[PDB]
């Protein structure tokens, strides 16, 4: 029984789901935008996930349990209904939907719907709405209230494809991997981070890219399922190794950040120095630990080229070791003659500019002095870059 958690989409989603579960009318074909796959060491996880998927075909499983979830908090996703596709036609339909992207017709959803858990995860809210009024087939009398209740329960259930494209990045890899991982596997599997963190991690997941046989790009929910499901990133080694790479990158960044922060705090809480030197130390240590060149070096050290963890093209992070040559404060201050030096290589004199102008004795001393231009007066102490005691 392979477990397949799927975030579906419709052309309202809540009304379609309620109609589909009740007895049917309002049943719109669902669009499996993101689908999960798991069954009950890191290499073993990679091989299991890769064998569960297939390079040529889809999910390799004779029996499929497919939980359908929407966006909202019960948890980023919340189960909406549960279906078991065990019949051969059901398995074929699921294979053609998860891989090719064909939407599931209402008849397949109704026939494969497992009433037990599907209504066991909703009888609580059915009783809640019954108490509010004082199975869910009795919503004909009170229907808009039920609609509002499921709108509030599943926040983000009804969203536009433009929303998905804007949130989860414009790129193929970013879209598929960030969406699937962040929305489903973060809760399923640690890595409870922000969407920006997942998008940046997927950005440096430089696995070999191959152009699609045809050139298409994502209006309304008619195309994004085919855009995402048939992509080479949602199947095989990429899908098998993306969570592993996210975990490895998170662990590496956390260990380097902690190693830097220990020294940063220790050599900050023990300085018996002036406030100016203290601020200089803080802004020098933050530059020494997070310089754009050093951050780029760390990113190129932690990036991988192959999904398989066995290859492990990632190199050890040199950020801490590079910071060692500067964090030697065992004891013009040492912090100044570093800060200025530091600033020069990353930013930009009176003598040279005066040599360029060859105004002390020249005619230009009065070229801006007597020319008050009508502002104020004290003239040729209300001193005169004029009118001082402007920018």
């Amino acid at each position: 029984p392979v477990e397949v958690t799927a975030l579906y989409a419709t052309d309202c989603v809540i009304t379609s789901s309620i109609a589909l579960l009740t007895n049917s009318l309002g049943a719109e074909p669902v669009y499996i935008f993101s689908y999960d796959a798991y069954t009950h060491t890191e290499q073993d996880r990679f091989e299991e996930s890769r064998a569960l998927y297939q390079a040529s075909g889809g999910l390799n499983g004779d029996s499929f349990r497919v939980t359908f979830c929407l966006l909202g908090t019960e948890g980023r996703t919340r189960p909406m209904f549960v279906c078991r596709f065990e019949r051969a036609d059901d398995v074929a339909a699921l294979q053609d939907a998860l891989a090719h992207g064909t939407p599931l017709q209402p008849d397949h959803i109704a026939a494969t719907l497992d009433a037990e858990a599907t209504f066991a995860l909703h009888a609580n809210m059915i009783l809640a709405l019954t108490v509010a009024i004082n199975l869910t087939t009795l919503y004909v009398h009170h229907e808009v209230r039920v609609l509002a209740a499921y709108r509030r329960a599943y926040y983000g259930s009804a969203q536009s494809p433009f929303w998905f494209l804007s949130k989860f990045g414009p790129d193929e890899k970013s879209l598929v991997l960030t969406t699937r991982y962040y929305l489903l596997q973060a809760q399923r599997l640690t890595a409870t981070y922000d969407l920006q963190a997942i998008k940046d991690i997927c950005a440096t997941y430089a696995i070999p890219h191959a152009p699609r046989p045809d050139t298409v790009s994502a209006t309304s929910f008619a195309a994004i399922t085919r855009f995402c499901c048939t992509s080479q990133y949602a199947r095989g080694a990429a899908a098998a190794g993306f969570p592993l790479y996210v975990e490895r990158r998170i662990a590496a960044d956390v260990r380097e950040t902690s190693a830097l922060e220990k020294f940063i705090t220790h050599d900050r809480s023990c300085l018996r120095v002036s406030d100016r030197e203290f601020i200089t130390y803080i802004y020098l240590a933050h530059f020494e630990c997070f310089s754009p060149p050093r951050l780029a070096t760390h990113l190129r050290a932690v990036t991988t080229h192959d999904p398989n963890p066995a290859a492990s093209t990632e190199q050890p992070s040199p950020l801490g070791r590079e910071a060692v040559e500067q964090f030697f404060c065992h004891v013009v201050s040492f912090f100044e003659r570093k800060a200025s030096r530091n600033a020069l290589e990353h930013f930009g004199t009176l003598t040279e500019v005066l040599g360029r102008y060859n105004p002390d004795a020249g005619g230009t001393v009065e070229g801006f002095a007597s020319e008050l231009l009508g502002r104020i007066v004290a003239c040729i102490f209300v001193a005169l870059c004029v009118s001082l005691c402007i920018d």
Binding site: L195, L388, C389
Partner: protein, 456 residues
């Protein structure tokens, strides 16, 4: 790369929002009763309203908006602002990253309304009899100073059967246990969002009154006690995430939390305070080092001075805003810009400023100025007190002698992104300037505390 210094923040807030209080410690409905009908603050009984505080400090553009996004993406909370502009700003910021709910003001929640806006606050005396600072007395005087709105809110809440949670609890007792009341907020939308979560993330919390933290805690416990919400039943305490800049946002929540001696012990700021020292606004050497000095109270040298050595008449300064000191000066500049431009030979004229409109986007009208119809805001000049909390790129500061502060200089000079679009008058630095060393010294001492975490 501030995505990894935020996970200690997440851990600490989740730990602080999970601890359960004792039954004898949580407030009970009887405390709100007989105080709702009480007339004078003198009859206020000594009662404790437990609460927890997490603080995010820093300067504008320090990444202080991404932490709110993370909190409202992995923790259950209600994002709330001191003003509507701030609420809209974080709504745009966070709804540009993930799902967002309409961020209501601290006025919309908390029960605050239009009639509550106008009140004769502060006309009730209070003498601190005990040891100078104690939680009982401080909360009681915060309620005393803000008594009119608190009294009206309690009367409205208790006067206006509230079985939304109790009916579900009765059914769970008959049957399920502590699982059906969690779906109550999703069934009845009329409920305040303070019922849904004990964490209220506040952005620009330094603009809220010193007295207003206790009022928010009081009315939150009020809604929690009348409605009998599961967080109140399991004895959860408020965990307000106050995000703001004490050195810029100006007798206020941030100052009350940082400077008070006993709130630093009860709330334990040392273990629940993060300092952000990044600044995405200014990215250049000189200006960056001067803002430093202006925020941390560093000694004034002769380089940062002279750095500032490198307006009233609109004759030739098109497309700039002016930050006058007093409101009368702003009204005068409105009387001048809408009079000189009358005969400029993009304006031609026709309530928040003095009046007459300038057509610089205010371009057309028909009345329906392009709308609920003709009241709009003129951003051409605005006062230094209100200058904070906004984002501009055409500032032209107009300091005056005699009342020249450095905190105001400070606020008015960092509103712009680049220093090239900066114009001024007689210099704030040098001359006679008044300094507030308390907040800068407190921030520096916090920076020398190993318990707090700092994130770039």
């Amino acid at each position: 790369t501030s995505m990894h210094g935020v996970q200690p923040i997440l851990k600490r807030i989740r730990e602080l929002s999970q601890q359960q209080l004792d039954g004898a410690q949580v407030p009970h409905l009887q405390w709100f009763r007989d105080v709702a009908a009480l007339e004078s603050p003198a009859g206020l009984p000594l009662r404790e309203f437990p609460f927890a505080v997490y603080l995010i400090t820093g300067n504008a553009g320090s990444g202080k908006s991404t932490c709110v996004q993370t909190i409202n993406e992995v923790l259950d909370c209600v994002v709330t602002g001191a003003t509507r502009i701030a609420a809209q700003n974080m709504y745009a910021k966070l709804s540009g990253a993930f799902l967002s709910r309409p961020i209501n003001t601290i006025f919309h929640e908390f029960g605050f309304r239009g009639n509550h806006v106008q009140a004769q606050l502060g006309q009730y005396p209070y003498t601190l009899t005990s040891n100078p600072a104690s939680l009982e007395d401080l909360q009681r005087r915060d309620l005393t100073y803000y008594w009119e709105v608190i009294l009206d809110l309690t009367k409205r809440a208790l006067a206006a059967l509230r079985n939304e949670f109790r009916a579900l609890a009765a059914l769970e007792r008959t049957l399920a246990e502590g699982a059906l009341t969690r779906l109550a907020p999703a069934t009845h939308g009329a409920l305040p969002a303070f019922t849904r979560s004990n964490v209220i993330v506040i952005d620009e919390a330094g603009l809220l009154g010193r007295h207003l933290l206790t009022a928010v805690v009081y009315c939150w416990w009020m809604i929690n006690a009348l409605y009998h919400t599961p967080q109140y039943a399991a004895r959860l305490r408020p965990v307000l995430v106050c995000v703001g800049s004490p050195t810029q946002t100006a007798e206020n929540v941030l100052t009350y939390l940082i400077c008070n001696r006993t709130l630093r012990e009860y709330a334990r700021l040392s273990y629940s305070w993060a300092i952000f020292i990044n600044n995405k606004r200014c990215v250049e050497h000189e200006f960056g080092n001067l803002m430093k000095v202006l925020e941390y109270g560093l000694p004034i040298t002769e380089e940062h001075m002279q750095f500032v050595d490198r307006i009233t008449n609109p004759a030739n300064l098109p497309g700039w805003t002016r930050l006058f000191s007093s409101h009368k000066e702003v009204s005068a500049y409105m009387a001048k810009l809408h009079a000189y431009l009358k005969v400029t030979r993009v304006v031609f004229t026709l309530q928040d400023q003095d009046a007459t409109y300038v057509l610089n986007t205010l371009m057309g009208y028909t009345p329906y100025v392009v709308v609920v119809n003709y009241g709009i805001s003129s951003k051409l000049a605005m006062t230094i007190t209100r200058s904070q909390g906004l984002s501009l790129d055409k500032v032209a500061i107009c300091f005056t002698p005699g009342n020249l502060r450095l905190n105001s200089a400070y606020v008015a000079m960092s509103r712009t992104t680049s220093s090239e679009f900066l114009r001024m008058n007689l210099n704030p630095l040098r001359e006679r300037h008044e300094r507030d060393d308390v907040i800068s010294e407190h921030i520096l001492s916090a920076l020398r505390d190993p318990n707090v975490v700092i994130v770039y």
